[PDB]
Design a protein around this ligand. Structure first.
Ligand code: SF4
Ligand code: ZN
Ligand code: ZN
Ligand code: ZN
Ligand code: ZN
Lengths: 367, 351, 754
């Protein structure tokens, strides 16, 4: 259902996803409308998003309850378009062809919105569901009665189309009486039997629409004992415990520590030109995805010409950013230009390194 | 009177990497009144807890969250390795209320689609927190189950207060037949421990499968503060990491490099793994009258040993549950603590 | 396993065992040692079939004498159940032993479920299919075909291929269950029916329904080769007596009488035309009558016998001429008088019942037609028709009805009783007089088999009490033992929901009608269960009309909407085919996700043979307790006979029958011991019957679970379902109630040899 080339060629799906995210359509166009990337590879990066979207789309709801319910669990809202109006009616249509056909036939005239569904209440919701209305409101007229007549034999032929030769464990038919020719008695009043056949038929239709599948030692001990003694030798003058002894030594220790405190403090855990900031951000995103495609390809490998095109484009982008920095220094001056250079230093270094690495690999392959 | 596991008989293999796709259940059933707020609120709370826990103990895996509302499976968190995203997603959900019927089939198919990108060495999984007593499928299900087991996708589900035949078949099917994974609960505490035991990697007796070396590299923290600049979210962040190879900043994570796409870790994640691979022998409870050992703790120093002949009190037992290999005592609290939190056995470390 | 019974190797096909099974084996062997009957109630919660077949096969294949086994399950459904299980046992026995089999064992049902001829089997009514196969392959149409090659005569040709190859030999070696038999004999284009029917002379063990054993009209071909001494097993024997009675009763309706009039007219036409063409053969048959009963071709008939012999198998038959009936025209006139007398006696105003002797004398009064000539009417008509070689039987169906009636009422006495009900009061004051004729003593039909066979068994998962059967059937036993369900766990929750939420006693006893209190109470019960139980639930209304009305006016309320919202409904309807279809969809839904409810009738076909395993049944119900006297007084007459002949009072017998059917319904919901399931009841009267139930049911039914209200019922079953859901598998308490492989039985009871 989902394939790499399939999502690649799902152009309408791809454009729908373009409509999905402003950021997405923006980055895509600036990778395209800026004479940049063919969309093919651009999606070739983004494939999982496409797959996810596609699956989120073509997701048929079950038949089952809502399908049924559309005849039972739906007996109140006599107003306008009720809950899940289009959803419920399509569930009806898949559930019952007759109503779909009647509604279609009654489009050019007789609106099936209010009056159609009003007469439908009587006609169908007596036909299906509850007992035979027979008397009472016999509004089942015209299309209703016609479709009634139809649906009768229609359900008949369906039921006909349902009969399997059930496996002989369950075969009640062959089980009953079709062993003997016997003479019993029987004693255990029309209508409603049709009701039972109705529920059976509904359920089985539902299920079928689902089966469809659609030093050490010596000196060690010596020194140890020495210390042990020293301890035992009263001593342990906590007064004599250094305090700091050499005021100089003390000072030096403090120096070290304040130095380290300063350095680690330098860790203060706001650009000027908001419009140029956003523009530079766009440039960074652009160069990032461009390099992304190379560092994919330059690793992986026979599509060498594609790598060549990517490399030429990347060199173009590098020169473009160089000119960008030149223009920034010209216009914004230095401090703002300095801030821009700082903001773009990492990406700039990465792309420059990628360019150098490609140059080295190209020289190695050539020489 | 003891309740202990007799022995661990797969202390040789587990799935260390994981990609578990928890799927909740947000459907009309979950609104009954058996668990204190409801099924649903308690479920989501424990789900948050489990998310924290699982992303702790398996800090190299990913995860995605899936609901089942109105017979549809609507992804609520892409498969991702950052716990906070999933946590927030669950936060958002918990204020929203269930509807429709649980469409187990749709959720299953959405997962199977979702886990395709996961590479061979990574291992797949799903964890259905199934709450209802029915499904509503728009297709054959055994078709899906067959596709699943074809794609080597183990599944574990935690039913609520009943047993559903199809789910039992599902667990029995994907997990190489060996049925133990359809555990259903009978109490809230049982539920907490259910999630807890879902946290760990999952062995049964692994078939001999492909075992593959995976390229990855470790980063080095950065120094500057004002030079705040990020290459995984394109912000200003006061300092982060460097891919050793891609050589671009990446906000703090065990994430995958967003430039050259290789896994990043420090080691402490690998340390957690080590802890899971080769655990200890379960500490033995010493005989009541046959111990004649030291009257203290060993790791701690507790005074809870015995009472020396007290009709029924001494006849009860002798709190001396003592590990095997180091053969040193340990009070009950110390043994519980060792076997739960820190797995270096105190004495067995020292020799 | 392969353990011993102090002489017998037993190739039990499972590693595990059950204790009750071992006791069953011990006691059934003890029975077979010494000729007796020894009814044995083994709860269906175990596998009775496996134990039975394993032990009996081992016995037959170990000792050299009792070479044949007869197994009579109630319905062909259980026939193929026994067959498939036996096939698996056989495969296991070979697998453990190599090849020491030389074994054949065959099912045996009828043409309608066996005839493979496409067009023939396309027919629905079993009688018609029988007739069609008879004509298509008779002793006569074959002659017409062979002497006169023409388009008139065709043939299944399956009979022909049989004639070629099968009647020199047999089917290869298997114990062919109907699936296997049909597949194979379809491949090799044979007629399975005649195959097995001729094969009976060779099968080591035979399985056939009760009717083939007791219905004298088809239990004719019993060829004492079949047993003469064999060991005979009645599985599911609690419904024996009713099978006997239904095999010996008979109905009459004026409409069929007019049909017989038409048939007699057609007979007059046929005899006229043939005697115009050929009568010398008719006189030859007169001579063949005058020599004797014409057994040479009234009995030596490979294909002929037309009207079965509804009397017991030839025991109560003389052999001389039927005197004046020798003339065919005489016979037609006799039937004319008979049918007219029947019509005029049918126009009788109101209910009247007579002994057969009394009716016989009365007929003699109106028309002096004697008993002795009357008895011969059946074979007389049949062989006359053969001499007529008619082209159809439908015209003569009523004729054979009357022949059967004449033979019965002219043969037996002082056990039977006539009755002439002029109408059906349920639609009273309409023209529909019925000349109902039935037996009373169940023992009459059985008596021949207990006379013939020596070692017989009676077995069911339900029989209780184990003394009513020796009373009614008048037979001697040895071991009347009941077995207790030794369980390391509860495993099922019998209840008696006497009071609904209104705390009101409920039943079906009041009427067959509505009383919205009762209806709403039951509906509430059903719907809350539908909420609570997982997939699979059953109910068993006491009678069909009851279900019709109840469900109709449930649909009147909104009650059915809720259970629709949860589970599926699958009703039980009189046509068997649609019933089977519904039942299989029920199974398919249970094993699928959606839960499904099947509601049927206790007396009905569903309870008879259908099984309800783990998934397919969790919570049976018994809406009301099944009773019959809703309808007329045939039960009253039989019960009169019961009281006078046996020291049994009415309500005793009625309660006994009701609990018989209740237990039969209930036992279906378990198969093994791993299975489980609630078994509720519902009626006030149930509470006092707690002792009538079979033992193993009674044990689980503690005192505190009596007359519970629906609400506490739901509470308890909720707790049950949860508890059973737990994997309570200590596997050391299962060494108590499973007697593990080859050892725990060996150790435990080889020591218990005390
Ligand atoms: S036995 Fe043969 S001839 Fe007779 S009905 Fe069956 S297929 Fe036809
Ligand atoms: Zn970042
Ligand atoms: Zn990198
Ligand atoms: Zn301690
Ligand atoms: Zn230790």
């Amino acid at each position: 259902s989902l394939s790499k080339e399939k999502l690649l060629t799902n152009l309408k799906l791809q454009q729908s996803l373009l409509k999905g995210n402003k950021v997405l359509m923006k980055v895509f166009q600036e990778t395209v409308i800026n004479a940049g990337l063919p969309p093919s590879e651009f999606w070739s990066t983004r494939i999982p998003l496409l797959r996810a979207f596609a699956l989120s789309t073509s997701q048929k709801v079950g038949p089952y309850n809502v399908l049924s319910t559309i005849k039972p669990v739906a007996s109140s809202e006599n107003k306008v378009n009720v809950n899940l109006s289009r959803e419920k009616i399509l569930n009806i249509f898949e559930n019952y062809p007759i109503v779909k056909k009647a509604y279609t036939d009654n489009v050019p005239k007789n609106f099936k919105e209010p009056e159609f569904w009003a007469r439908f209440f009587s006609s169908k919701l007596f036909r299906k569901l509850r007992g035979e209305k027979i008397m009472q409101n016999d509004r089942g007229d015209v299309i209703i009665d016609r479709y009634l007549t139809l649906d009768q034999e229609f359900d008949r032929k369906d039921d006909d189309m349902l009969l399997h030769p059930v496996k002989k464990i369950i075969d009640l038919d062959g089980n009953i009486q079709d062993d003997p020719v016997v003479r019993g008695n029987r004693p255990d009043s029309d209508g409603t039997v049709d009701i039972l056949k109705g529920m059976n038929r509904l359920s089985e239709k539902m299920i079928m629409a689902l089966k469809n599948e659609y030093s050490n030692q010596q000196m060690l001990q010596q020194l140890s004992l020495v210390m042990d003694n020293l301890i035992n030798k009263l001593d342990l003058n906590q007064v004599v415990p250094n305090n700091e002894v050499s005021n100089k030594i003390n000072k030096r220790v403090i120096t070290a520590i304040k130095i380290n405190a300063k350095q680690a403090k330098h860790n203060n855990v706001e650009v000027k030109s908001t419009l140029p900031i956003d523009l530079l951000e766009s440039c960074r995103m652009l160069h990032t995805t461009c390099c992304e495609f190379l560092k994919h390809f330059y690793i992986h490998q026979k599509q060498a010409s594609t790598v060549k095109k990517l490399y030429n484009h990347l060199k173009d982008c590098i020169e473009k950013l160089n000119e960008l920095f030149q223009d920034v220094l010209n216009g914004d001056g230095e401090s703002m230009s300095n801030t821009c250079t700082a903001y773009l230093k990492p990406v700039l270094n990465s792309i420059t390194l990628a360019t150098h690495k490609y140059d080295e690999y190209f020289n190695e392959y050539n020489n | 009177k003891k309740r202990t596991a007799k022995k661990n008989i797969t202390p040789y293999q587990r799935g260390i990497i994981r990609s578990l796709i928890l799927t909740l259940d947000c459907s009309e059933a979950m609104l009954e009144k058996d668990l204190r707020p409801n099924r649903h609120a308690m479920i989501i709370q424990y789900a948050i807890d489990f998310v924290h826990e699982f992303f702790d103990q398996n800090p190299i895996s990913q995860m995605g969250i899936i609901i089942m509302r109105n017979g549809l499976a609507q992804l609520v968190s892409q498969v991702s390795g950052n716990p906070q995203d999933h946590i927030d997603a669950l936060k958002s959900i918990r204020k929203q209320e269930p509807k429709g019927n649980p469409s187990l089939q749709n959720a299953l198919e959405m997962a199977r689609g979702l886990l395709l990108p996961v590479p061979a060495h990574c291992t797949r999984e799903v964890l259905i927190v199934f709450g209802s007593l029915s499904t509503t499928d728009p297709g054959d299900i055994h078709q899906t189950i067959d596709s699943l087991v074809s794609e080597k996708i183990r599944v574990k589900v935690l039913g609520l207060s009943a047993q559903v035949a199809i789910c039992k078949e599902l667990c029995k099917a994907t997990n190489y037949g060996d049925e133990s994974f359809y555990k259903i609960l009978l109490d809230e505490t049982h539920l907490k421990e259910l999630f807890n035991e879902a946290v760990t990697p999952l062995p049964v007796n692994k078939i001999n499968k492909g075992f593959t070396l995976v390229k990855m590299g470790f980063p080095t923290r950065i120094f500057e503060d004002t030079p705040t600049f990020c290459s995984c979210h394109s912000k200003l962040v006061y300092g982060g990491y460097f891919c050793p190879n891609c050589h671009s900043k990446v906000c703090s994570l065990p994430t995958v490099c967003p430039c050259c796409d290789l896994m990043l870790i420090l080691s402490t994640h690998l340390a957690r793994s080590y802890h899971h691979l080769m655990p200890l022998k379960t500490f033995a409870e010493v005989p009541t009258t046959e111990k004649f050992r030291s009257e203290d703790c060993f790791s701690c120093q507790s005074r809870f040993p015995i009472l020396k002949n007290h009709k029924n009190g001494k006849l009860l037992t002798s709190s001396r549950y003592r590990c095997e290999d180091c053969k040193q005592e340990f009070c009950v609290d110390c043994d519980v603590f060792i076997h739960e939190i820190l797995h270096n056995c105190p004495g067995c470390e020292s020799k | 396993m392969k353990f011993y019974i102090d002489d017998l190797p037993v190739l039990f096909p499972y590693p595990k065992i059950y204790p009750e099974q071992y006791n069953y084996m011990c006691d059934i062997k003890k029975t077979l040692d010494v000729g007796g009957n020894s009814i044995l109630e083994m709860p269906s919660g175990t596998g009775k079939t496996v134990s039975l077949l394993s032990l009996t096969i081992a016995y037959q294949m170990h000792y050299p004498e009792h070479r044949k086994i007869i197994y009579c399950s109630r319905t062909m459904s259980e026939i193929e159940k026994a067959l498939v299980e036996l096939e698996n046992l056989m495969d296991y026995r070979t697998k453990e032993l190599g090849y020491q089999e030389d074994f054949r064992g065959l099912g045996l049902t009828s043409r309608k479920n066996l005839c493979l001829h496409p067009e023939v089997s396309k027919e629905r009514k079993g009688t018609v299919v029988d007739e069609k196969c008879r004509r298509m392959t008779n002793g006569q149409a074959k002659r017409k075909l062979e002497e006169d090659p023409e388009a008139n005569v065709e043939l299944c040709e399956y009979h022909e291929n049989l004639y070629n190859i099968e009647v020199e030999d047999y089917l290869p070696k298997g114990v062919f269950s109907f699936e296997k038999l049909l597949k194979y004999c379809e491949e090799k284009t044979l007629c399975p029916y005649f195959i097995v029917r001729r094969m009976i002379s060779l099968c080591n063990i035979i399985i056939y329904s009760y009717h083939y054993l007791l219905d004298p009209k088809i239990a004719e071909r019993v060829s004492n080769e079949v047993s003469k001494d064999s060991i005979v097993i009645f599985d599911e024997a609690h419904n024996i007596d009713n099978v006997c009675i239904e095999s010996l009763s008979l109905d009459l309706t004026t409409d069929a009488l007019r049909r017989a009039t038409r048939g007699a007219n057609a007979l007059d036409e046929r005899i006229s035309e043939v005697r115009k063409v050929d009568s010398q053969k008719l006189q030859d048959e007169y001579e063949k009558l005058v020599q004797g009963l014409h057994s040479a071709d009234i009995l030596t008939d490979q294909e002929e016998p037309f009207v079965e012999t509804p009397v017991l198998p030839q025991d109560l038959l003389t052999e001389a001429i039927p005197g004046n009936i020798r003339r065919a025209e005489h016979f037609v006139s006799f039937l004319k008088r008979l049918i007219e007398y029947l019509k005029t006696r049918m126009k009788v105003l109101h209910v009247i019942s007579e002994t057969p002797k009394s009716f016989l004398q009365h007929l003699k009064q109106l028309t002096f037609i004697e008993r002795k000539p009357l008895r011969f009417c059946s074979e007389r008509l049949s062989l006359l028709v053969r001499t007529l070689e008619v082209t159809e039987v439908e015209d003569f169906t009523a004729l054979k009805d009357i022949a059967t009636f004449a033979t019965l009422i002219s043969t037996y006495e002082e056990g039977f009783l006539l009755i002439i009900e002029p109408y059906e009061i349920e639609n009273a004051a309409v023209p529909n007089p019925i000349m109902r004729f039935t037996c009373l003593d169940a023992s009459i039909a059985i008596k021949p088999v207990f006379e013939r066979f020596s070692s017989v068994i009676i077995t069911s998962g339900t029989i209780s009490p184990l003394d009513m059967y020796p009373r009614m059937l008048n037979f001697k036993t040895v071991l009347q033992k009941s077995y207790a369900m030794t369980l390391a766990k509860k495993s099922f929750l019998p209840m008696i929901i006497t009071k609904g939420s209104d705390q009101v006693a409920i039943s079906s006893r009041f009427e067959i009608r509505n009383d919205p209190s009762i209806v709403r109470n039951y509906g509430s019960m059903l719907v809350e269960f539908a909420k609570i139980t997982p997939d699979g639930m059953v109910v068993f209304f006491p009678s069909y009309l009851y279900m019709e009305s109840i469900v109709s006016m449930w649909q009147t309320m909104g009650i059915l909407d809720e259970v629709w919202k949860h589970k599926l409904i699958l009703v039980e309807t009189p046509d068997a085919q649609e019933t089977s279809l519904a039942l299989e969809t029920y199974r398919k839904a249970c094993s699928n996700g959606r839960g499904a409810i099947l509601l049927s009738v206790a007396r009905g076909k569903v309870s008879e043979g259908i099984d309800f395993d783990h998934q397919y049944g969790r919570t049976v119900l018994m809406i009301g307790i099944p009773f019959q006297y809703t309808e007329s007084r045939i039960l009253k007459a039989r019960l009169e006979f019961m009281r006078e002949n046996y020291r049994i009072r009415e309500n005793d017998f009625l309660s006994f029958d009701a609990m018989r059917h209740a237990a039969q319904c209930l036992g279906r919901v378990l198969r093994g011991k791993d299975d489980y399931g609630v078994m509720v009841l519902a009626d006030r009267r149930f509470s006092r019957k707690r002792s009538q139930l079979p033992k193993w049911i009674a044990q689980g039914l503690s005192d505190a679970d009596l007359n519970l209200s629906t609400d506490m019922a739901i509470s308890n079953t909720k707790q049950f379902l949860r508890t059973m859901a737990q994997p309570t598998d200590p596997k050391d308490q299962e060494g108590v109630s499973v007697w593990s492989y080859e050892d725990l039985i060996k150790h435990q009871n080889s020591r218990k040899d005390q």
